[PDB]
Paper text:
The salicylate synthase MbtI from Mycobacterium tuberculosis (Mtb, the etiological agent of TB) is the first enzyme involved in the biosynthesis of mycobactins. These small-molecule siderophores are capable of chelating iron, a key cofactor involved in several mycobacterium-specific biological processes. MbtI has been structurally and biochemically characterized;2 it is essential for the survival of Mtb under iron-deficient conditions, and, as such, it has been identified as a promising therapeutic target. MbtI belongs to the group of structurally homologous Mg2+-dependent menaquinone, siderophore, and tryptophan (MST) enzymes, which transform chorismate by rearrangement, to generate precursor molecules for the respective biosynthetic pathways.
Considering the inherent difficulty in obtaining MbtI–Mg2+ cocrystals and the results of our biochemical assays, we hypothesized that we could compensate for the rather low affinity of MbtI for its cofactor by using saturating concentrations of Mg2+. Interestingly, 2.1 Å resolution data were collected from a non-isomorphous crystal grown under these conditions. In chain A, the Mg2+ interacts with the oxygen of Gly421, with four ordered water molecules, and with a sulfate anion. The coordination pattern of Mg2+ in chains B and D is analogous: the ion could be modeled as directly interacting with Glu297, Glu434, and two ordered water molecules, which in turn make H-bonds to Glu294 and Glu431. The salicylate coordinates the Mg2+ ion with its carboxylic moiety, which also forms additional H-bonds with the peptide backbone through Gly270 and Gly421 and with the side chain of Thr271. As previously noted, the bond between the carboxylic function and Gly270–Thr271 is responsible for the adoption of the closed conformation. The presence of bound salicylate in the structure is remarkable, especially considering that the natural substrate was not added to the crystallization solution. Unsurprisingly, the position that was occupied by the pyruvate is here taken by a sulfate ion, provided in the crystallization solution as the Mg2+ counterion. Observing such a conformation in this ternary complex is not surprising when high concentrations of Mg2+ are present; consistent with previous hypothesis and biochemical data, the bound Mg2+ ion stabilizes the enzyme in a close conformation, which in turn prevents the loss of salicylate from the active site.
Residue numbers in the entry: 5 to 449
The structure:
Amino acid sequence: SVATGAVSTASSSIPMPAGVNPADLAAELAAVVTESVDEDYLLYECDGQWVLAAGVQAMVELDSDELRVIRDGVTRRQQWSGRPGAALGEAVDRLLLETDQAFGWVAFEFGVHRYGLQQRLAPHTPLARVFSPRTRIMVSEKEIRLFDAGIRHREAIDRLLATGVREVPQSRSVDVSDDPSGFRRRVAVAVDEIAAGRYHKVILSRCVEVPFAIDFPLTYRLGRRHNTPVRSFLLQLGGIRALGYSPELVTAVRADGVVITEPLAGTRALGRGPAIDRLARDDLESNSKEIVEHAISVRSSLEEITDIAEPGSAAVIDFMTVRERGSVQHLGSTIRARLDPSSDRMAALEALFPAVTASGIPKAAGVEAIFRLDECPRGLYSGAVVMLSADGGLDAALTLRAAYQVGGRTWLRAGAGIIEESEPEREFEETCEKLSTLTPYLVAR
Ligand SMILES: [Mg+2]
Ligand SMILES: [Mg+2]
């Protein structure tokens, strides 16, 4: 599972009691374990394992202008040039010499350097934050595994197993029908650029301000019982709080060399009744426009994966099937390959980042159009939440279907892939469908 190879603990597992849900226990642990000590954390769900990385032992901060390594209140600064993946990889490999796993996030802006667009970034633009935790607690349906977990973490687990998790309170509604960023006018500009032949597709997005503060662990729990994401996360790291139900896996690199990527394209609503959802499912599977965009994205994923894979190892093992993602359903393909000996996990991330779902087609022209037609910098939105291991593992989830809090600002953000035949009204409605992954499940603070 996640706990394989170098990711190991000699500690005995605690068996999971019968009616206890792992997402609820892990999110409650994140709230309790860090409230009493005011410490940062990242909860990452990966293949049935909810990994709670609690406390910051060491932090790697990659900005557009410098790289910092912070440990025990001491900051080491350094200038960097060239690929941001090479700079981040070198600093994170040093963290992983002392600990078996590292966690964090990668901003959308991390992906602009491969296209020669980094000079458009403002000074001190955040690119990545990756830390090694003080403690890890892995929760699954079967058991709870502890990695360097003290008496305090054990007492917290024991109290939650004895009393049970908190009841999730009532949710508070938010209106997403307003368009203060002029998303529909920005879509019409992109449609005219595509008609003029500048590019084939660009992903544009809009922010939705939440007019009240939310409780991130309780909102995470409520939304997770109504969603089926590929990965999910809940974090409090520095100045940002975030939660999300990642619909798409940018890349998974295992220590045994297997590389996985799972591109998505096309969207229909889900959760509106069985017969209506099955009409939308049949429409999505047979719709010419959605099929063309899905095949063009698979062709792009195969090109990027071929650059970092052993020759003849790239393979589509699941092609163009409907993937259900709570309030929406999409076309998805699963691509598998073997990491070439001349390549590494950071090079694999750099080849597959940004996702087509975050940029466009061709990816270089989509990223350039996003600088002009979307609210920049995007930050965490359309970037990735990552988990790395000492033996070469990397798991990167696309940061979509997420909520954020920085300062007093709480917001949601959703986008749509705009093509030549796009109608601004249908693209706006598609952002509402994607926003419905979280809007009925916001628990106020
Ligand atoms: Mg190539
Ligand atoms: Mg589209």
